[PDB]
Amino acid sequence: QVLRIGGIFETVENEPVNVEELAFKFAVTSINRNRTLMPNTTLTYDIQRINLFDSFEASRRACDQLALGVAALFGPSHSSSVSAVQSICNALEVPHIQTRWKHPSVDSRDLFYINLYPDYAAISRAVLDLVLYYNWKTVTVVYEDSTGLIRLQELIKAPSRYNIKIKIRQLPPANKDAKPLLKEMKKSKEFYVIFDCSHETAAEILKQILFMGMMTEYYHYFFTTLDLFALDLELYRYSGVNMTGFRLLNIDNPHVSSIIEKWSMERLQAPPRPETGLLDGMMTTEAALMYDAVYMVAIASHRASQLTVSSLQCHRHKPWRLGPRFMNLIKEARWDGLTGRITFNKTDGLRKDFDLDIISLKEEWKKIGIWNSNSGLNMT
Amino acid sequence: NLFDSFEASRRACDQLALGVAALFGPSHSSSVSAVQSICNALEVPHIQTRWKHPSVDSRDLFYINLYPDYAAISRAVLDLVLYYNWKTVTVVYEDSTGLIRLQELIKAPSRYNIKIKIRQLPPANKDAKPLLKEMKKSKEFYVIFDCS
């Protein structure tokens, strides 16, 4: 059979490039270029364009695409738009996969909620046993917003079972406000800091810390972003200061080398990039996880059989028969992608059991150990 | 029926088909978002009665809330504890929402010298008798109870 898929992307202003659907186009193109796995034939997509800052427009467009007939829904790309679409997803037996983070609730039915984001409690536990491993009695972690510590529920209760000294830093949303915090921490004799931020602020943080001359080996820097390779770190004349970070991606599986050189060449033929921190030839987190989601749909289609899309109305509501079967196809897939092994639980739709590579900066990146999800860290 | 955003959305559709000057409810933060987007698309005034998770990206004047925000509560609890000052305190919360509404007490070491112990009750409706046992064994007697 020939199936259809609905691509719900919210257009972001100041960027007509929108690398997200470009990544999706490569995903569908490459899966159509691989011939050793035919589900029954080639597969085709359906895409409609939605503007940002409005979810119910995406709602009509999703139900119109469903009336056209699609196997599942991709997105939405905004947190607010995620909440609304499960209203129709729950009805008509519509499974949904999410590419945007959302707070787990009790209204959520674990059958139609699937997200490709890693478990954040694992990240908190990982930084816990790492700081236990090298044994920092003094730790300062900086966050930007209220949600930041919901990444880190456990280090706040760390002094309970294990004695420790904990300090925290907060920055106003204006990145030009880093000078008072930085001067007060340097006058506080605070030398060990852990960064809980994303890639949108790593460059500004590093340039700010570079400007006022805090490059001494006394400091030790850690990041929660996963694009540590995606951002350039060869800014230190001597790389003697301990740079520590986590890596979930890998350069092994020479198909990964093929796709990185791929991405390099299209970005060369792409229009000029909108972010100066990005350099060609190497993936970001969102692109990798959404490639893995496309892979999940690929094996779902390959294991799919005797399945067709149907015209379903958001105004006339009838439960569509192939909901649970497609959700099962999603639910018992096995694959070791760019994120590693995939594990499923009936308590949520997030993926679990990930392994994080610890990275050290190249001397003036490097692999120095590994952490297992269920057996701790293995050092080399 | 509790926790059904689809039926709430259809009831909102019925109400707007009738035509109303204001819409009240629902009481589920999960459910209010869908109807809120529906009615923002339909651009009508509305009043909501419970706190909703921050998920705003553009200024919507369509969202008229009457609920004690956690932020005023926050500055209130800070100035109260500062008035009757201490050196060591302890905090216990329910879930991430407790973190959202107590980020400032978490930050309390930064602005002034103060010690906070961060506790959390099991999410199974069980007894935290150990937690309090080690808390009294810690020679600390002053714990906030942030709870519904």
Coordinates of C-alpha atoms in Angstrom, one line a residue:
Chain A
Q1 CA 0.0 0.0 0.0
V2 CA 0.9 3.7 -0.3
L3 CA 0.6 5.6 2.9
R4 CA 0.5 9.4 3.6
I5 CA 2.0 11.4 6.5
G6 CA 1.1 14.9 7.7
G7 CA 3.9 17.4 8.4
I8 CA 2.7 20.1 10.8
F9 CA 5.4 22.8 11.1
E10 CA 5.0 26.2 12.5
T11 CA 6.8 28.8 10.4
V12 CA 9.2 31.0 12.4
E13 CA 9.8 34.6 11.4
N14 CA 13.2 36.1 10.4
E15 CA 14.1 32.8 8.9
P16 CA 12.8 31.6 5.5
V17 CA 15.4 28.8 5.5
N18 CA 13.7 26.7 8.3
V19 CA 16.2 23.9 8.4
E20 CA 13.6 21.6 10.1
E21 CA 11.7 20.7 7.0
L22 CA 14.9 20.6 5.0
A23 CA 16.0 17.9 7.4
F24 CA 12.7 16.2 6.9
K25 CA 13.1 16.4 3.1
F26 CA 16.5 14.7 3.4
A27 CA 14.9 12.1 5.7
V28 CA 12.2 11.1 3.2
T29 CA 14.5 11.4 0.2
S30 CA 17.2 9.1 1.8
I31 CA 14.6 6.6 3.0
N32 CA 13.3 6.6 -0.6
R33 CA 16.9 6.1 -1.8
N34 CA 17.4 3.0 0.3
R35 CA 16.2 0.0 -1.6
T36 CA 17.2 -3.0 0.6
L37 CA 14.0 -2.2 2.7
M38 CA 10.8 -1.9 0.8
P39 CA 7.7 -1.9 3.1
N40 CA 5.7 -2.5 -0.1
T41 CA 6.8 0.5 -2.3
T42 CA 8.0 4.0 -2.0
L43 CA 6.4 6.4 0.5
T44 CA 5.1 10.0 0.0
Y45 CA 4.5 12.9 2.3
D46 CA 1.9 15.6 2.9
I47 CA 3.0 19.0 4.2
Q48 CA 1.0 22.1 5.1
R49 CA 2.4 25.4 6.3
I50 CA 1.3 26.9 9.6
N51 CA 2.3 30.2 11.2
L52 CA 3.8 30.6 14.6
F53 CA 1.9 31.9 17.7
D54 CA -1.3 30.2 16.9
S55 CA -2.3 26.6 17.6
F56 CA -5.9 26.2 16.4
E57 CA -5.0 27.1 12.8
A58 CA -2.7 24.1 13.0
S59 CA -5.7 22.3 14.4
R60 CA -7.9 22.9 11.4
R61 CA -5.0 22.1 9.1
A62 CA -4.3 18.9 10.9
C63 CA -7.9 17.7 10.6
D64 CA -8.0 18.8 6.9
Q65 CA -4.9 16.7 6.3
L66 CA -6.6 13.8 8.2
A67 CA -9.6 14.2 5.9
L68 CA -7.1 14.0 3.0
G69 CA -5.8 10.9 4.8
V70 CA -2.5 10.6 6.6
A71 CA -1.0 7.8 8.7
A72 CA 0.1 10.1 11.6
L73 CA 0.9 13.7 12.6
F74 CA 4.4 15.2 12.9
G75 CA 5.0 18.0 15.4
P76 CA 3.9 20.5 16.5
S77 CA 7.0 22.6 16.8
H78 CA 5.7 24.9 19.6
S79 CA 4.9 23.8 23.2
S80 CA 1.6 25.6 23.2
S81 CA 0.5 23.9 19.9
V82 CA 1.3 20.5 21.3
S83 CA -1.4 20.6 23.9
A84 CA -4.3 21.4 21.6
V85 CA -3.7 18.8 18.9
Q86 CA -4.1 15.8 21.3
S87 CA -7.8 16.9 21.6
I88 CA -8.4 15.6 18.1
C89 CA -5.6 13.0 18.4
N90 CA -7.4 11.2 21.3
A91 CA -10.6 11.1 19.2
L92 CA -10.8 9.2 15.9
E93 CA -8.1 6.8 17.2
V94 CA -5.3 9.1 16.1
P95 CA -1.8 8.3 17.4
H96 CA 0.6 11.3 17.8
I97 CA 4.4 11.7 17.9
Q98 CA 5.9 14.8 19.5
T99 CA 9.1 16.6 18.5
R100 CA 8.7 19.3 21.2
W101 CA 9.0 19.0 24.9
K102 CA 5.9 19.0 27.1
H103 CA 5.2 18.7 30.8
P104 CA 3.8 15.2 31.6
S105 CA 0.3 15.4 33.1
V106 CA -2.4 13.0 34.2
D107 CA -4.8 14.0 31.4
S108 CA -2.2 12.4 29.1
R109 CA -3.1 9.0 27.7
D110 CA 0.2 7.1 27.3
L111 CA -1.0 5.6 24.0
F112 CA -1.1 8.8 21.9
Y113 CA 1.8 10.7 23.5
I114 CA 5.2 9.9 22.1
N115 CA 8.2 12.3 22.3
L116 CA 11.7 11.8 21.0
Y117 CA 13.3 13.7 23.8
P118 CA 15.7 12.1 26.2
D119 CA 14.8 11.7 29.9
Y120 CA 16.0 14.7 31.8
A121 CA 16.1 12.8 35.2
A122 CA 18.8 10.7 33.6
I123 CA 20.8 13.8 32.8
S124 CA 20.4 15.0 36.4
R125 CA 21.5 11.7 37.7
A126 CA 24.4 11.6 35.3
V127 CA 25.8 15.0 36.4
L128 CA 25.3 13.7 39.9
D129 CA 27.5 10.7 39.6
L130 CA 30.0 12.6 37.5
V131 CA 30.5 15.3 40.2
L132 CA 30.6 12.4 42.7
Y133 CA 33.3 10.8 40.6
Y134 CA 35.6 13.7 40.5
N135 CA 34.3 14.8 43.9
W136 CA 33.6 18.5 43.8
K137 CA 32.7 19.6 47.3
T138 CA 31.9 23.1 45.9
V139 CA 29.5 23.4 43.0
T140 CA 27.7 26.4 41.4
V141 CA 25.1 25.8 38.7
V142 CA 23.6 28.6 36.6
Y143 CA 20.1 28.6 35.2
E144 CA 18.2 31.1 33.1
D145 CA 14.5 30.5 33.9
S146 CA 12.2 28.8 36.4
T147 CA 12.0 25.6 34.2
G148 CA 15.7 25.2 34.3
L149 CA 15.8 23.5 37.7
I150 CA 13.1 21.0 36.6
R151 CA 16.0 19.6 34.7
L152 CA 17.8 19.2 38.0
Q153 CA 15.4 18.0 40.7
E154 CA 18.1 15.9 42.4
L155 CA 21.2 18.0 43.1
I156 CA 19.1 20.4 45.2
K157 CA 18.3 17.4 47.5
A158 CA 21.9 16.1 47.1
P159 CA 23.1 17.2 50.6
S160 CA 20.6 14.8 52.1
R161 CA 22.4 11.5 51.4
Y162 CA 25.8 12.9 50.6
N163 CA 27.3 16.1 52.1
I164 CA 27.9 18.8 49.6
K165 CA 28.0 22.6 49.1
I166 CA 25.6 23.9 46.5
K167 CA 25.3 27.4 45.0
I168 CA 23.2 28.6 42.1
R169 CA 23.3 31.5 39.6
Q170 CA 20.4 33.1 37.7
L171 CA 20.6 35.4 34.7
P172 CA 18.0 37.9 33.5
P173 CA 16.7 37.2 30.0
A174 CA 18.9 40.0 28.6
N175 CA 22.2 38.4 27.9
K176 CA 23.9 41.8 28.5
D177 CA 23.2 41.4 32.3
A178 CA 26.0 38.8 32.8
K179 CA 28.6 41.3 34.1
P180 CA 27.1 41.8 37.6
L181 CA 26.6 38.1 38.2
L182 CA 30.1 37.3 36.8
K183 CA 31.8 40.0 38.9
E184 CA 29.9 38.9 42.1
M185 CA 30.9 35.3 41.5
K186 CA 34.6 36.2 40.9
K187 CA 34.6 38.3 44.0
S188 CA 32.9 35.4 45.8
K189 CA 35.9 33.1 45.2
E190 CA 33.6 30.8 43.3
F191 CA 35.6 28.8 40.8
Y192 CA 33.5 25.7 39.9
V193 CA 30.5 26.4 37.8
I194 CA 28.1 24.1 35.8
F195 CA 26.2 25.5 32.9
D196 CA 22.5 24.5 32.4
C197 CA 21.6 26.1 29.1
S198 CA 20.9 25.3 25.4
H199 CA 22.9 26.1 22.3
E200 CA 21.3 29.5 21.8
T201 CA 23.3 31.0 24.7
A202 CA 26.5 28.9 24.8
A203 CA 28.3 31.3 22.4
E204 CA 27.3 34.4 24.3
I205 CA 28.2 32.8 27.6
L206 CA 31.7 31.8 26.3
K207 CA 32.4 35.2 24.7
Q208 CA 31.4 36.9 27.9
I209 CA 33.6 34.7 30.0
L210 CA 36.4 35.2 27.5
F211 CA 36.2 39.0 27.5
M212 CA 36.9 39.7 31.2
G213 CA 39.8 37.2 31.4
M214 CA 38.5 34.2 33.3
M215 CA 40.5 31.6 31.4
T216 CA 42.7 30.3 34.3
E217 CA 43.0 26.6 35.1
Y218 CA 41.3 27.3 38.4
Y219 CA 38.0 27.2 36.6
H220 CA 36.2 24.1 35.5
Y221 CA 33.3 24.4 33.0
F222 CA 30.5 21.9 32.3
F223 CA 27.5 22.3 29.8
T224 CA 24.1 20.7 29.5
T225 CA 23.9 21.4 25.8
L226 CA 24.6 18.6 23.4
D227 CA 25.9 20.7 20.5
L228 CA 29.3 21.1 22.2
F229 CA 31.0 19.9 19.0
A230 CA 28.5 22.0 16.9
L231 CA 29.9 25.1 18.6
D232 CA 33.6 25.9 18.1
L233 CA 35.9 25.6 21.1
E234 CA 39.3 26.3 19.6
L235 CA 39.4 29.7 21.2
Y236 CA 41.9 28.9 24.0
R237 CA 45.6 29.2 23.3
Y238 CA 46.3 26.5 25.9
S239 CA 43.5 24.0 26.5
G240 CA 44.7 23.3 30.1
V241 CA 41.5 24.3 31.7
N242 CA 39.3 21.3 32.3
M243 CA 36.4 21.3 29.8
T244 CA 33.8 18.7 30.5
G245 CA 30.5 17.9 28.7
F246 CA 28.2 15.1 27.6
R247 CA 27.9 13.7 24.1
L248 CA 24.9 11.6 23.0
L249 CA 25.8 11.6 19.3
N250 CA 28.6 9.6 17.7
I251 CA 30.9 9.7 14.7
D252 CA 31.0 5.9 14.3
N253 CA 28.8 3.9 12.0
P254 CA 30.4 5.3 8.8
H255 CA 26.9 6.0 7.5
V256 CA 27.1 8.8 10.0
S257 CA 30.2 10.1 8.3
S258 CA 28.3 9.8 5.0
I259 CA 25.4 11.9 6.3
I260 CA 27.7 14.5 7.9
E261 CA 29.5 15.1 4.6
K262 CA 26.1 15.1 3.0
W263 CA 24.9 17.8 5.3
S264 CA 28.1 19.7 4.8
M265 CA 27.6 19.8 1.0
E266 CA 24.0 20.8 1.1
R267 CA 24.8 23.6 3.6
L268 CA 27.5 24.7 1.2
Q269 CA 24.8 24.8 -1.5
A270 CA 22.3 26.2 1.0
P271 CA 21.7 29.9 1.4
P272 CA 23.8 31.7 4.1
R273 CA 23.2 30.3 7.6
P274 CA 21.1 32.4 10.1
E275 CA 23.2 31.6 13.2
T276 CA 26.9 32.4 13.3
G277 CA 27.6 29.7 15.9
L278 CA 26.7 26.9 13.5
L279 CA 29.4 25.3 11.3
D280 CA 28.6 23.0 8.4
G281 CA 29.2 19.3 8.3
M282 CA 27.8 18.3 11.7
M283 CA 24.3 17.7 13.0
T284 CA 22.4 19.5 15.8
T285 CA 20.2 17.7 18.4
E286 CA 16.8 18.4 16.8
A287 CA 17.7 17.2 13.3
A288 CA 19.2 14.0 14.7
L289 CA 16.2 13.2 16.8
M290 CA 13.8 14.0 14.0
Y291 CA 15.8 11.8 11.7
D292 CA 15.4 9.0 14.3
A293 CA 11.7 9.7 14.4
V294 CA 11.5 9.4 10.6
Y295 CA 13.4 6.1 11.0
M296 CA 10.8 5.0 13.5
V297 CA 8.0 5.7 11.0
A298 CA 10.1 3.9 8.4
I299 CA 10.3 0.6 10.3
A300 CA 6.6 1.1 11.3
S301 CA 5.7 1.2 7.6
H302 CA 8.0 -1.7 6.8
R303 CA 6.2 -3.8 9.5
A304 CA 2.9 -2.3 8.3
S305 CA 0.7 -4.5 6.1
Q306 CA -2.8 -4.2 4.7
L307 CA -3.1 -0.6 5.9
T308 CA -4.6 2.5 4.2
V309 CA -5.4 6.1 5.1
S310 CA -9.0 7.3 5.3
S311 CA -11.0 10.5 5.1
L312 CA -11.8 11.6 8.7
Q313 CA -13.6 14.8 9.7
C314 CA -12.9 17.1 12.6
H315 CA -16.6 18.1 12.4
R316 CA -18.0 14.5 12.0
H317 CA -16.4 12.3 14.5
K318 CA -16.0 8.5 14.0
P319 CA -13.3 6.3 15.6
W320 CA -10.9 5.3 12.8
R321 CA -10.1 1.6 12.9
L322 CA -6.3 1.5 12.3
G323 CA -5.3 3.7 15.3
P324 CA -4.2 1.0 17.7
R325 CA -2.5 -1.1 15.0
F326 CA -0.3 1.8 13.9
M327 CA 0.4 2.7 17.5
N328 CA 1.5 -0.9 18.1
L329 CA 3.7 -0.7 15.0
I330 CA 5.3 2.4 16.7
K331 CA 5.3 0.7 20.1
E332 CA 7.3 -2.5 19.4
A333 CA 10.0 -1.2 17.0
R334 CA 13.7 -1.9 17.7
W335 CA 16.5 0.3 16.4
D336 CA 19.8 1.7 17.5
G337 CA 19.9 5.2 15.9
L338 CA 21.9 8.4 16.5
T339 CA 20.4 8.4 20.0
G340 CA 21.3 4.8 20.6
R341 CA 19.0 2.1 21.8
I342 CA 15.3 2.9 22.2
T343 CA 13.3 1.8 25.2
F344 CA 9.5 2.1 25.8
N345 CA 7.5 2.3 28.9
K346 CA 3.8 2.3 29.6
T347 CA 4.2 5.3 32.0
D348 CA 5.1 7.8 29.3
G349 CA 6.0 8.1 25.7
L350 CA 9.5 9.5 26.2
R351 CA 12.5 7.3 25.3
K352 CA 14.8 6.1 28.0
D353 CA 18.0 4.1 28.6
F354 CA 20.5 6.4 26.9
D355 CA 24.3 6.5 27.1
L356 CA 26.2 9.8 27.3
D357 CA 29.8 10.2 26.1
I358 CA 31.9 12.5 28.3
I359 CA 34.1 14.8 26.2
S360 CA 37.3 16.7 26.9
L361 CA 38.6 19.6 24.9
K362 CA 41.3 19.0 22.3
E363 CA 44.7 20.2 23.5
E364 CA 45.9 23.5 22.2
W365 CA 36.8 16.5 20.6
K366 CA 38.1 13.8 22.9
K367 CA 36.6 10.7 24.5
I368 CA 37.5 10.0 28.1
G369 CA 34.7 7.7 29.3
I370 CA 31.1 6.6 29.0
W371 CA 28.0 6.4 31.3
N372 CA 25.5 3.7 31.0
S373 CA 21.9 4.4 31.9
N374 CA 21.4 1.4 34.1
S375 CA 25.0 0.5 35.1
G376 CA 26.5 3.9 35.8
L377 CA 29.7 5.4 34.3
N378 CA 32.6 3.4 32.8
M379 CA 35.8 5.4 32.7
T380 CA 38.7 4.8 30.3
Chain B
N1 CA -16.3 13.8 31.9
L2 CA -13.0 14.7 33.6
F3 CA -9.9 15.1 31.4
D4 CA -11.3 15.1 27.9
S5 CA -10.1 18.0 25.8
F6 CA -12.0 16.9 22.7
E7 CA -15.4 17.1 24.4
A8 CA -14.5 20.5 26.0
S9 CA -13.5 21.7 22.5
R10 CA -16.8 20.6 21.1
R11 CA -18.7 22.2 24.0
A12 CA -16.8 25.4 23.3
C13 CA -17.8 25.1 19.6
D14 CA -21.5 24.7 20.7
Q15 CA -21.2 27.7 23.0
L16 CA -19.7 29.9 20.2
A17 CA -22.4 28.6 17.8
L18 CA -24.9 29.8 20.4
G19 CA -22.9 33.0 20.8
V20 CA -21.7 34.2 24.2
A21 CA -20.1 37.3 25.6
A22 CA -17.9 35.3 27.9
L23 CA -16.8 31.7 28.5
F24 CA -16.0 30.2 31.9
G25 CA -13.8 27.1 32.5
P26 CA -12.7 24.5 32.2
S27 CA -10.7 23.7 35.3
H28 CA -8.1 21.4 33.7
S29 CA -4.9 23.1 32.7
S30 CA -4.6 20.5 29.9
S31 CA -8.1 21.2 28.7
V32 CA -8.1 25.0 28.9
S33 CA -5.3 25.3 26.3
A34 CA -7.2 23.8 23.5
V35 CA -10.4 25.9 24.0
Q36 CA -8.1 28.9 24.6
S37 CA -6.6 28.5 21.2
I38 CA -10.0 27.9 19.7
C39 CA -11.4 31.1 21.1
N40 CA -8.2 33.1 20.4
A41 CA -8.7 32.1 16.8
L42 CA -12.3 33.3 17.3
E43 CA -11.0 36.4 19.1
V44 CA -13.5 36.6 22.0
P45 CA -12.9 37.7 25.7
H46 CA -12.7 35.0 28.3
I47 CA -12.0 34.5 32.0
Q48 CA -10.2 31.5 33.5
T49 CA -10.3 30.5 37.1
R50 CA -7.1 28.4 37.7
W51 CA -3.4 28.8 37.2
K52 CA -2.1 27.6 33.8
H53 CA 1.4 26.5 32.9
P54 CA 3.4 29.3 31.1
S55 CA 3.3 28.5 27.4
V56 CA 2.7 32.0 25.9
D57 CA 4.8 33.1 22.9
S58 CA 2.9 36.2 21.7
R59 CA 1.0 38.8 23.7
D60 CA -2.6 37.6 23.8
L61 CA -5.1 39.9 25.4
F62 CA -7.6 37.1 25.1
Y63 CA -6.5 35.6 28.4
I64 CA -8.0 37.2 31.5
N65 CA -7.0 35.3 34.6
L66 CA -8.1 35.8 38.2
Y67 CA -5.8 33.5 40.2
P68 CA -3.1 34.2 42.8
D69 CA 0.0 33.9 40.7
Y70 CA 2.9 32.1 42.2
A71 CA 5.2 35.2 41.8
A72 CA 3.4 37.5 44.2
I73 CA 3.2 34.5 46.6
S74 CA 7.0 34.2 46.1
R75 CA 8.0 37.7 47.0
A76 CA 5.5 37.5 49.9
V77 CA 7.1 34.4 51.4
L78 CA 10.6 35.9 50.9
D79 CA 9.8 39.1 52.7
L80 CA 8.0 37.2 55.5
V81 CA 10.9 34.9 56.1
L82 CA 13.4 37.8 55.9
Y83 CA 11.3 39.8 58.5
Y84 CA 11.5 36.8 60.9
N85 CA 15.0 35.9 59.8
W86 CA 16.9 32.7 60.4
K87 CA 20.1 30.9 59.3
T88 CA 18.9 27.4 58.4
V89 CA 15.6 26.4 56.8
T90 CA 14.1 23.4 55.0
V91 CA 11.7 23.1 52.1
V92 CA 9.5 20.3 50.8
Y93 CA 7.5 20.3 47.5
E94 CA 5.2 18.1 45.6
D95 CA 6.5 18.2 42.0
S96 CA 8.1 20.4 39.4
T97 CA 5.4 23.0 40.0
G98 CA 6.7 23.4 43.5
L99 CA 10.1 24.2 41.9
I100 CA 8.3 26.7 39.6
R101 CA 6.8 28.5 42.6
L102 CA 9.8 28.2 44.8
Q103 CA 12.7 29.0 42.5
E104 CA 13.2 32.1 44.6
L105 CA 13.6 30.2 47.9
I106 CA 16.0 27.9 45.9
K107 CA 17.9 31.1 44.9
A108 CA 17.8 32.4 48.5
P109 CA 21.5 31.5 49.2
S110 CA 22.6 33.9 46.4
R111 CA 21.2 37.2 47.6
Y112 CA 21.9 36.6 51.3
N113 CA 23.6 34.1 53.6
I114 CA 21.1 31.4 54.3
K115 CA 20.9 27.6 54.3
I116 CA 18.0 25.6 52.7
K117 CA 17.4 21.9 52.7
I118 CA 15.2 20.7 49.9
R119 CA 12.8 17.8 50.6
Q120 CA 10.1 16.1 48.5
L121 CA 7.3 13.7 49.5
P122 CA 6.8 10.5 47.6
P123 CA 4.3 10.8 44.7
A124 CA 2.3 7.8 46.0
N125 CA 0.2 9.4 48.8
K126 CA 2.4 7.8 51.4
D127 CA 3.9 8.9 54.6
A128 CA 7.2 10.9 54.7
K129 CA 7.9 10.0 58.4
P130 CA 11.6 9.2 57.5
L131 CA 12.1 12.6 55.8
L132 CA 10.9 14.4 58.9
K133 CA 12.9 12.0 61.1
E134 CA 16.2 12.9 59.5
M135 CA 15.1 16.5 59.4
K136 CA 14.7 16.6 63.2
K137 CA 17.9 14.6 63.4
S138 CA 19.6 17.4 61.4
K139 CA 19.0 19.9 64.3
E140 CA 16.7 21.9 62.1
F141 CA 13.1 22.7 63.0
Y142 CA 11.8 25.2 60.4
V143 CA 10.3 23.6 57.2
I144 CA 7.9 25.2 54.6
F145 CA 5.0 23.1 53.5
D146 CA 4.1 24.1 50.0
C147 CA 1.0 22.0 49.2
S148 CA -2.5 21.9 47.8

